[PDB]
Design an enzyme around this catalytic site. Sequence first.
Site, PDB file in Angstrom:
ATOM      1  N   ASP A 139       0.804  -1.196   0.000  1.00 58.57           N
ATOM      2  CA  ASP A 139       0.000   0.000   0.000  1.00 58.57           C
ATOM      3  C   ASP A 139       0.835   1.242   0.000  1.00 58.57           C
ATOM      4  O   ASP A 139       0.454   2.228   0.587  1.00 58.57           O
ATOM      5  CB  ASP A 139      -1.002  -0.003   1.135  1.00 58.57           C
ATOM      6  CG  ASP A 139      -2.189   0.862   0.852  1.00 58.57           C
ATOM      7  OD1 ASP A 139      -2.350   1.300  -0.290  1.00 58.57           O
ATOM      8  OD2 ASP A 139      -2.969   1.109   1.767  1.00 58.57           O
ATOM      9  N   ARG A 143       0.112   9.021   0.600  1.00 59.24           N
ATOM     10  CA  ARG A 143      -0.763   9.147   1.765  1.00 59.24           C
ATOM     11  C   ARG A 143      -0.294   8.274   2.922  1.00 59.24           C
ATOM     12  O   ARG A 143      -0.606   8.589   4.075  1.00 59.24           O
ATOM     13  CB  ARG A 143      -2.212   8.796   1.413  1.00 59.24           C
ATOM     14  CG  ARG A 143      -2.412   7.323   1.213  1.00 59.24           C
ATOM     15  CD  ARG A 143      -3.797   6.993   0.766  1.00 59.24           C
ATOM     16  NE  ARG A 143      -3.745   6.406  -0.559  1.00 59.24           N
ATOM     17  CZ  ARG A 143      -3.538   5.117  -0.794  1.00 59.24           C
ATOM     18  NH1 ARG A 143      -3.366   4.283   0.226  1.00 59.24           N
ATOM     19  NH2 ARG A 143      -3.502   4.674  -2.049  1.00 59.24           N
ATOM     20  N   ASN A 144       0.461   7.208   2.642  1.00 64.68           N
ATOM     21  CA  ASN A 144       0.993   6.295   3.648  1.00 64.68           C
ATOM     22  C   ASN A 144       2.461   6.568   3.978  1.00 64.68           C
ATOM     23  O   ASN A 144       3.176   5.661   4.418  1.00 64.68           O
ATOM     24  CB  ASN A 144       0.822   4.850   3.180  1.00 64.68           C
ATOM     25  CG  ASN A 144      -0.635   4.421   3.180  1.00 64.68           C
ATOM     26  OD1 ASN A 144      -1.418   4.942   3.961  1.00 64.68           O
ATOM     27  ND2 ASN A 144      -1.002   3.475   2.305  1.00 64.68           N
ATOM     28  N   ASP A 157       1.265   2.570   7.692  1.00 62.99           N
ATOM     29  CA  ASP A 157       0.120   1.789   7.217  1.00 62.99           C
ATOM     30  C   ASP A 157       0.369   0.430   6.626  1.00 62.99           C
ATOM     31  O   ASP A 157       0.310   0.236   5.437  1.00 62.99           O
ATOM     32  CB  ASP A 157      -0.837   2.571   6.344  1.00 62.99           C
ATOM     33  CG  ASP A 157      -2.201   1.953   6.315  1.00 62.99           C
ATOM     34  OD1 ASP A 157      -2.301   0.732   6.364  1.00 62.99           O
ATOM     35  OD2 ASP A 157      -3.188   2.677   6.262  1.00 62.99           O
TER      36      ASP A 157
HETATM   37  C1  LIG Z   1      -1.972   6.653   7.212  1.00 60.46           C
HETATM   38  C2  LIG Z   1      -3.146   5.634   7.384  1.00 60.46           C
HETATM   39  S1  LIG Z   1      -3.158   5.010   9.109  1.00 60.46           S
HETATM   40  O1  LIG Z   1      -4.404   4.412   9.463  1.00 60.46           O
HETATM   41  O2  LIG Z   1      -2.188   3.895   9.310  1.00 60.46           O
HETATM   42  N1  LIG Z   1      -2.789   6.394  10.067  1.00 60.46           N
HETATM   43  C3  LIG Z   1      -1.623   6.647  10.746  1.00 60.46           C
HETATM   44  C4  LIG Z   1      -1.760   7.879  11.357  1.00 60.46           C
HETATM   45  C5  LIG Z   1      -0.679   8.629  12.204  1.00 60.46           C
HETATM   46  N2  LIG Z   1      -0.702   9.928  12.164  1.00 60.46           N
HETATM   47  C6  LIG Z   1       0.195  10.679  12.807  1.00 60.46           C
HETATM   48  N3  LIG Z   1       0.105  12.110  12.745  1.00 60.46           N
HETATM   49  C7  LIG Z   1      -0.849  12.864  11.880  1.00 60.46           C
HETATM   50  C8  LIG Z   1      -1.417  12.382  10.686  1.00 60.46           C
HETATM   51  C9  LIG Z   1      -2.303  13.226   9.973  1.00 60.46           C
HETATM   52 CL1  LIG Z   1      -3.019  12.571   8.432  1.00 60.46          CL
HETATM   53  C10 LIG Z   1      -2.575  14.501  10.457  1.00 60.46           C
HETATM   54  N4  LIG Z   1      -3.492  15.414   9.716  1.00 60.46           N
HETATM   55  C11 LIG Z   1      -3.374  16.943   9.804  1.00 60.46           C
HETATM   56  C12 LIG Z   1      -3.973  17.613   8.552  1.00 60.46           C
HETATM   57  C13 LIG Z   1      -5.383  17.265   8.370  1.00 60.46           C
HETATM   58  N5  LIG Z   1      -5.670  17.943   7.258  1.00 60.46           N
HETATM   59  C14 LIG Z   1      -6.735  17.390   6.613  1.00 60.46           C
HETATM   60  C15 LIG Z   1      -6.993  18.065   5.259  1.00 60.46           C
HETATM   61  N6  LIG Z   1      -7.114  19.425   5.373  1.00 60.46           N
HETATM   62  C16 LIG Z   1      -7.134  19.961   4.204  1.00 60.46           C
HETATM   63  C17 LIG Z   1      -6.141  20.000   6.138  1.00 60.46           C
HETATM   64  C18 LIG Z   1      -5.887  19.276   7.471  1.00 60.46           C
HETATM   65  C19 LIG Z   1      -5.602  15.817   8.329  1.00 60.46           C
HETATM   66  C20 LIG Z   1      -4.969  15.050   9.496  1.00 60.46           C
HETATM   67  C21 LIG Z   1      -1.972  14.980  11.666  1.00 60.46           C
HETATM   68  C22 LIG Z   1      -1.099  14.122  12.354  1.00 60.46           C
HETATM   69  O3  LIG Z   1      -0.423  14.441  13.568  1.00 60.46           O
HETATM   70  C23 LIG Z   1      -0.443  15.807  13.973  1.00 60.46           C
HETATM   71  N7  LIG Z   1       1.176  10.152  13.507  1.00 60.46           N
HETATM   72  C24 LIG Z   1       1.290   8.832  13.591  1.00 60.46           C
HETATM   73  C25 LIG Z   1       0.357   8.020  12.926  1.00 60.46           C
HETATM   74 CL2  LIG Z   1       0.497   6.251  13.045  1.00 60.46          CL
HETATM   75  C26 LIG Z   1      -3.026   8.411  10.998  1.00 60.46           C
HETATM   76  C27 LIG Z   1      -3.707   9.622  11.301  1.00 60.46           C
HETATM   77  C28 LIG Z   1      -4.992   9.820  10.787  1.00 60.46           C
HETATM   78  C29 LIG Z   1      -5.623   8.844   9.986  1.00 60.46           C
HETATM   79  C30 LIG Z   1      -4.956   7.655   9.681  1.00 60.46           C
HETATM   80  C31 LIG Z   1      -3.643   7.452  10.202  1.00 60.46           C
END
Ligand SMILES: CCS(=O)(=O)n1cc(-c2nc(Nc3cc(Cl)c(N4CCC(N5CCN(C)CC5)CC4)cc3OC)ncc2Cl)c2ccccc21
Length: 312
Positions: A139, A143-144, A157
């Site tokens: 995968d 995004r991952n 992921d």
């Molecule tokens: C990857 C598939 S997963 O299932 O394996 N997965 C692993 C993690 C993970 N995330 C983290 N940090 C992490 C990840 C994310 Cl995306 C965010 N964004 C901030 C921006 C947001 N935008 C959205 C769009 N808009 C336009 C602007 C704002 C979206 C969310 C912030 C973060 O920290 C501060 N650290 C460890 C793990 Cl392990 C995770 C988090 C959410 C969903 C699935 C996840």
Amino acid sequence: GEAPNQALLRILKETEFKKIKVLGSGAFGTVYKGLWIPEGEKVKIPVAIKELRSPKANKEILDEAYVMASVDNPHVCRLLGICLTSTVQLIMQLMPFGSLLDYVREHKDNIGSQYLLNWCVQIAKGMNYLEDRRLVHRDLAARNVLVKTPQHVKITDFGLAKLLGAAAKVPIKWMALESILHRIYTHQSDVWSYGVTVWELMTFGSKPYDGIPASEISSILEKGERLPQPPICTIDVYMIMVKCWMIDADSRPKFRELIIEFSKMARDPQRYLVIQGDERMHLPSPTDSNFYRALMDEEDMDDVVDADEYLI
Ligand SMILES: CCS(=O)(=O)n1cc(-c2nc(Nc3cc(Cl)c(N4CCC(N5CCN(C)CC5)CC4)cc3OC)ncc2Cl)c2ccccc21
């Protein structure tokens, strides 16, 4: 016939961490930002807590835990432990800057060639390590890939990751052609997805094959079409991508070669990526304790320790 896997599975007390905010939510479950405070240790570790909304969910969660407890590399996601709640929680290192796909979209006009090519080196080092452990991610995509800092990224992921034998909601636009038709998966089919990932980075986060139905992609690829050359891409960089997209999987590059190739280009970046205003760019990476007070929404962050420094 592999060696015995002596990794440790760490069981963590749910009582010793705080969930602070949703990071992402879907049918797959929810991920929370949080702090882990092991009792007596004098440390606060920023974490992501992965959880489901069911015995069928616990099976797949623990399979992921099996995978992540067995990998140790600077460019692969770090599993701290699990919590035995009604549904098991996966506790991981927090990556404060989100996914690389969102990071290059939001910071598009401030990302230069040096960062782009270093990300390609690091992703390839992560994948080469996974290959060394006979693991096929399946995968790989921008995004991952998560951003610990703009200078450091990690593959994440593993919800689809598997142990290779030269054998096997699937994301069709990142998949090798032999996986689309025959459900086969090798390290060489990860190289294909490596190619699409670089393409995503080189176009600052464009969707591959935009508007096209996934039902249509297999025939596009059989005709010989591929993703186009990105504006900033010299033919040196684009040619590497095109090689990841070859039909004969033994003809695609190896991850250890991609490390070497992108590393050489990272020596003279402007010679390989052509980006308007490259010398005038800079990306913010506040490592200091002010930065974590704001992200964790906590007044006291004196004893904060990143998981990469918290060992046992
Ligand atoms: C990857 C598939 S997963 O299932 O394996 N997965 C692993 C993690 C993970 N995330 C983290 N940090 C992490 C990840 C994310 Cl995306 C965010 N964004 C901030 C921006 C947001 N935008 C959205 C769009 N808009 C336009 C602007 C704002 C979206 C969310 C912030 C973060 O920290 C501060 N650290 C460890 C793990 Cl392990 C995770 C988090 C959410 C969903 C699935 C996840």
